[PDB]
């Protein structure tokens, strides 16, 4: 019922509560991954995965 | 062993068996492998806290 902040371990907001109104919201950063250039040598081709 | 065959085979699957129940009571026996995994998840746990 306190204040409209959230925590975790690593000091990164997780859930919060609007100002203007009371409904309670969690925060996640989206869709976060990594590339992995699958690829041959350069002179044998260019094309990668 | 050509004389002692079947003793052999009795002992052999014995062993098997109490093997197969050791390793069926506690985890401890795998001691080794609960580390390479713990300490591993414990350096990534404290690299977070950071
Ligand atoms: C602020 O917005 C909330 C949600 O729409 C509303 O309930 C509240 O009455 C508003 N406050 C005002 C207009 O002072
Ligand atoms: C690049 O050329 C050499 C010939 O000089 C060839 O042996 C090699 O396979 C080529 N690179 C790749 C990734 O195939």
Known sequence: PFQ?????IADTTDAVRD???????????????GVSVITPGTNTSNQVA | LYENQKLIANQFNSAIGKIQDSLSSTASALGKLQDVVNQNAQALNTLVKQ
């Open chain 1, 19 to 33: 100002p203007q109104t009371l409904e309670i919201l969690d925060i996640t950063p989206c869709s976060f991954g």
């Open chain 1, 4 to 8: 409209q902040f959230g925590r975790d």
